[PDB]
Amino acid sequence: GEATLLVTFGSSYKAPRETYAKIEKTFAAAYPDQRISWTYTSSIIRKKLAQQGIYIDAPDEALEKLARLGYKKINVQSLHVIPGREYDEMIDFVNKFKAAHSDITVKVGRPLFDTDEDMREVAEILHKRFQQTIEKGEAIVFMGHGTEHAANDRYARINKIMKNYSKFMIVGTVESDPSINDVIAELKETGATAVTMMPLMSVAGDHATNDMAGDEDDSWKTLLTNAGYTVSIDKLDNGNFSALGDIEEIRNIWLKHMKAT
């Protein structure tokens, strides 16, 4: 008997939690006999959800509960985009758990942008999603968070990989490099005058939605409109802002990572 624990930072908001449900459904369909469990690593988000009647286990709680149920084989899957700080803290609570349980074998699955192969697959999926927009000469801008962690290199790396698919697919980050000014300089080279944006994030969290599309003077929508672009935000059919985890083929990459060799 195998069990799977899905690891994310977490969110208290309805739209990200619908994306989480899609990820659970993808894993449950692939492994219909397995228990699938969740942990949200943000302590404060867990606390706010508890105030709402929604009870999410802390990581140590989540794994101990699996141990107390008899499981000797546990999969712990990162739902992160890059192998950065949160991925490292995953490994840490996984090892704190392995130490207390020498008989339990724990398999760890990597985040989305782990390898060049992963980033090509993501680029192809996003190209497919936006091909009709790209065909009209409109650019697609992907907004990642950005970090000082060395894994920040994935954003510049997937930006270059995306050039094999279209010059109109452009990646930047809010807090690091490539920056919004790099995005604007790249846009200028394409000849586009219209932009569709999407977060290069697993879910469209509340803070990210403001960074991307808010009326704040430094939101990406404002800064691109100041530059003269006509800006649209990508949405799901249900009207929510889209994110990577909403795309079934993206969810399959986390799925494959859980068993990769």
- Interface of this chain with Mg ion, residues 185 to 204, rule: CB under 5 A: 200-201, 204
- Report the residue number, 66 or 200, with the smaller CB distance to Mg ion: 200
Which of 247, 250, 255, 258 binds Mg ion (CB under 5 A)? It is 247
We find the least distance from the C-beta atom of residue 215 to Mg ion, in angstroms, to be 20
Total residue count of the chain as it appears in this document: 261
User: Is 251 an interacting residue with respect to Mg ion (CB under 5 A)?
Assistant: no
Residue list 62-101, contact with Mg ion (CB under 5 A) = 80-82
Which residue type occupies 157? R
Q: Could you tell me the smallest distance in angstroms from the CB atom of residue 157 to Mg ion? A: 13
Whether the CB-CB separation of 94 and 23 falls below 8 Å is answered with no
Catalytic residue among 101, 145, 149, 257: 145
Ligand-binding annotation for 127, yes or no, is no
- The residue (of 45 and 204) whose beta carbon lies closer to Mg ion is 204
Q: What is the DSSP string of 120-153?
A: HHHHHHHHHHHHHHHHTT-EEEEEE---SSGGGH
Q: Is 175 known to sit in a ligand binding site?
A: yes
Give the residue, chosen from 246, 251, 253, 254, that forms a contact with Mg ion under the rule CB under 5 A: 246
The candidate with the shortest Cα–Cα distance to 7, out of 133, 131, 106, is 106
Q: Is 101 a catalytic residue?
A: no
Which residue do the tokens 């929508």 mark? 221
3-state helix, strand, coil in the chain (%, to 5): 45, 20, 35
Query: Rounded to whole angstroms, how far apart are CA atoms 119 and 90?
Result: 21
- Could you say which residues in the range 114-173 bind Mg ion, by CB under 5 A? 129, 144-145
Of 163, 184, 167, residue with least CA distance to 119: 163
Tell whether 207 is in a known binding site: yes
How many Cα atoms within 13 Å fall on the side-chain side of residue 35? 17
Q: Between residues 3 and 183, which has the closer beta carbon with respect to Mg ion?
A: 183
Q: Is 161 helix (H, G, I), strand (E, B) or coil?
A: helix
Q: Which residues are annotated as a binding site?
A: 145, 175, 207
Active site residues: 145
Q: Which residues are annotated as a binding site for Co(2+)?
A: 145, 175, 207
> In the complex, which residues of this chain contact Mg ion (CB under 5 A)?
15, 19, 80-82, 129, 144-145, 200-201, 204, 240, 243, 246-247
